[PDB]
Amino acid sequence: PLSAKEKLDLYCEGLADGLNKTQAYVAAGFSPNHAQRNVAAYHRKHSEYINAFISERIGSHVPMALRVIVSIAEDPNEKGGIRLKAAQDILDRGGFGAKQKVELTTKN
Amino acid sequence: LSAKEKLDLYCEGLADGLNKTQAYVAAGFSPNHAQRNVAAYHRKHSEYINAFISERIGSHVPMALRVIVSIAEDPNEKGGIRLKAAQDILDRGGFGAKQKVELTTKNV
Amino acid sequence: PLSAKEKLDLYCEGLADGLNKTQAYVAAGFSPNHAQRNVAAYHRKHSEYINAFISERIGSHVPMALRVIVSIAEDPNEKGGIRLKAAQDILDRGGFGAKQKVELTTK
Amino acid sequence: AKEKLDLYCEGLADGLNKTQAYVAAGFSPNHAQRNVAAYHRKHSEYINAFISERIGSHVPMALRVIVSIAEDPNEKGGIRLKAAQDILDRGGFGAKQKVELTT
Amino acid sequence: PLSAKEKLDLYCEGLADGLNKTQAYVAAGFSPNHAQRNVAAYHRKHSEYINAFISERIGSHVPMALRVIVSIAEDPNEKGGIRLKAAQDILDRGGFGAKQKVELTTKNV
Amino acid sequence: PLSAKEKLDLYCEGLADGLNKTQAYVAAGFSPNHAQRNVAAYHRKHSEYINAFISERIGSHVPMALRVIVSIAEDPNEKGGIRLKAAQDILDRGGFGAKQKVELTTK
Amino acid sequence: PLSAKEKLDLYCEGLADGLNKTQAYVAAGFSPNHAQRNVAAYHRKHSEYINAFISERIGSHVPMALRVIVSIAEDPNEKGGIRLKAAQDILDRGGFGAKQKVELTTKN
Amino acid sequence: SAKEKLDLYCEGLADGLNKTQAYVAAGFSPNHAQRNVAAYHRKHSEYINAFISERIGSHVPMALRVIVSIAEDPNEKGGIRLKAAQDILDRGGFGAKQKVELTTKNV
Amino acid sequence: PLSAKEKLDLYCEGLADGLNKTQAYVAAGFSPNHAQRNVAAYHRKHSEYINAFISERIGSHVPMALRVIVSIAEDPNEKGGIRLKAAQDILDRGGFGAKQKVELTTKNV
Structure with a gap:
């Protein structure tokens, strides 16, 4: 019941x-x-x-991922490229990046 | 039947x-x-x-989720792989990308 | 005939x-x-x-590829990155994916 | 509460x-x-x-990591270049055109 | 003649x-x-x-390429990444692919 | 005070x-x-x-980045690919590089 | 003259x-x-x-390149990945390709 | 001063x-x-x-000369020479551009 | 003068x-x-x-680049992937290219 x-x-x-x-x-x-x-x-x-x-179960595991990413960013025994990708990842999620595209429409 | x-x-x-x-x-x-x-x-x-067959593809998603969680939490995995799996679950959890500035020119 | x-x-x-x-x-x-x-x-x-x-012939092979990807995901003795890519692929084709981009026009 | x-x-x-x-x-x-x-x-x-505030809390650490990788003379060249490019991209100096032709 | x-x-x-x-x-x-x-x-x-x-001639070669791709997909003694890329490829051409993107326009005029 | x-x-x-x-x-x-x-x-x-x-400080570090990129471009004993990427990068920031797309919309 | x-x-x-x-x-x-x-x-x-x-001269070399790609795709003593990339390339030029993208526009 | x-x-x-x-x-x-x-x-x-945008413009001839030298150096790795040649051909004004679109609707 | x-x-x-x-x-x-x-x-x-x-000077160097790409494509002792990339580049420059994309704008405005 x-x-x-x-x-x-x-x-x-x-x-x-x-x-x-x-x-x-x-x-x-x-x-x-x-x-x-x-x-x-x-x-x-x-x-x-x-x-x-299923999306709720995905969201339940995100703090582990955050700890993983910060630990890799601050790890002195990691490769330079992986630390750089981790720092880039948290900076992007923090609200910093940019893209400039110029358009040119030649219509026919 | x-x-x-x-x-x-x-x-x-x-x-x-x-x-x-x-x-x-x-x-x-x-x-x-x-x-x-x-x-x-x-x-x-x-x-x-x-x-x-699309339903069969969807039938395997808990296995894939468990695999990705295991790769993120496996303590002896390479740094780059842990970082990429963590980035993946953070993106599927709803934490993502950023800006783009446009500049529109037109034909003479 | x-x-x-x-x-x-x-x-x-x-x-x-x-x-x-x-x-x-x-x-x-x-x-x-x-x-x-x-x-x-x-x-x-x-x-x-x-x-x-020929497109019908290509579609005839999708269950083989499906088995291949599921096997790569379920292989405990496979490289980590490839297992990760297989699981990512199964999650994406299952319907859980990517996200936003912001627009701003300077004209 | x-x-x-x-x-x-x-x-x-x-x-x-x-x-x-x-x-x-x-x-x-x-x-x-x-x-x-x-x-x-x-x-x-x-x-x-x-969680988004906690993500933002780690931004100074990330900035310091990226500047250290850019300034390290004993780091591989490709990683130094990617870091310097990255801070240049975030500082506001970037890319260029794309031309369209729609029939 | x-x-x-x-x-x-x-x-x-x-x-x-x-x-x-x-x-x-x-x-x-x-x-x-x-x-x-x-x-x-x-x-x-x-x-x-x-x-x-020339494009017709390119279309003449598709069964060879298809056979190559399927053999790579079913070859158990091939590297994992290439088997994965091949299976992904035949699934994409078979009609099972990608997904969403959200737009946010902070407009000017 | x-x-x-x-x-x-x-x-x-x-x-x-x-x-x-x-x-x-x-x-x-x-x-x-x-x-x-x-x-x-x-x-x-x-x-x-x-x-x-924080965005101001990011801009505060850019002259260092420019010096590194130009120096790696000018290094005579560096690998070809890295020199190529740096030269490509400064040429792109100088205002060069083109890309054409033809579109066909079947509504 | x-x-x-x-x-x-x-x-x-x-x-x-x-x-x-x-x-x-x-x-x-x-x-x-x-x-x-x-x-x-x-x-x-x-x-x-x-x-x-020069655009005519680039087209002058197209059959040679096509022969190159077909031979690389059919050569049995090539790496698996390169064989796959060549076969994919000729399949794309033959007219068999990619798929969907979903839009979601939030207003301002 | x-x-x-x-x-x-x-x-x-x-x-x-x-x-x-x-x-x-x-x-x-x-x-x-x-x-x-x-x-x-x-x-x-x-x-x-x-x-700094002027300083970037000061270095573009350096980047061009470096790229041309990398492209014509006969004892450089093949992939790097090819990437350099592709780049100089792209900046010269020659690129491919095909794309067919199909826009649907939920009604 | x-x-x-x-x-x-x-x-x-x-x-x-x-x-x-x-x-x-x-x-x-x-x-x-x-x-x-x-x-x-x-x-x-x-x-x-x-x-x-300076754009005319950059355009001045294209014939050398074409010669190099055809040479890399014609080198019998070059890596397979690199020859394939050279052939791909020249085929794209000749006028043979990309493929399909399906759009679906289902949203709550």
């Missing part, structure tokens, strides 16, 4: 690691005999929620 | 074994009329197969 | 595999002496269909 | 765990997997602003 | 294979002694047909 | 080199007793000026 | 091959006492024709 | 890259450094930018 | 080879004392012509 969206979230969490749709479906608590078509219909209904959830 | 279930079974065989005729004969079809029916059948049902 | 279209499709498959205009022409089951002008005329007549066929 | 949220935000930014950073902010320790989800999706924009 | 179109076709074939202006000119069957001034006018006259012929 | 603008400039310069916000705050000459809260409010207030200062 | 058009073409050919303005100028036959005073202006006169001449 | 110290301060920044250091090296008041250099630099930003 | 239009071009040649503004100014036969400012002002006056002249 659980929220249908919460059992859907359990299905999503089980799908994110163990990589099988019907397996996560029955692990979400559905009919084990009416299994392989009902998981397909359920997935085809709530596709947009699944995409938003 | 419905001929559509035999078609999706045929699509499953096409997704794994890379042969039109082999996936045809695995569906339970004519072994004598082999080159004839699979070509017309495939040329008719293109959109369902394309949607099915 | 064979269709012109079917003969044409056999000629296209033979051109994709046996790599010669006159050779694939006669392998389609045609006249071997009235060939060198006739195969050229036949090719320039049905060019759009041959190109559509 | 926002100051306790900032406490939780720093704990999340450094220790990389939702439930642990939740209880490390001085919040309810028993019921974790449900309330942290609602709180996290609730203040998403605040967390994003928090 | 040949027309201007068939001698032009022989001229184009000789130019595609034997690579010489006077050589491809005379293999079409003209006078070899007073050649160097007239070939410039001839080529500048039928340039577009030669270009279309 | 110096402006809030001069105290802000010293705080920003200290922020350029001196990492601690609170360290750059007290080195700018403010109250050391309540610094860690007041530096947060002060920084969140004057964000645009600090960003402008 | 020489036709002016043929003489200009000969001067152009000398620039194309023997790499000198004054060399091709004296190779046309011109006033011996003065050349530099006029040759610079003369070159500035027929600039567009010389550009057409 | 004042102009001499103005451009010498910039060349000193080009040589050892520090504003207070180049200010005290330029030959003005050595006693007050951190405030007077800030005011002086903020005033003449356009002047230093124009000066 | 050397005209100001042609003497400027001689100064331009001196700037392209002998690499100094004031030195080329006095090497045109000017006052060596009227020095550091006068060459700067002269340069600021005729900037567009100086740029056009």
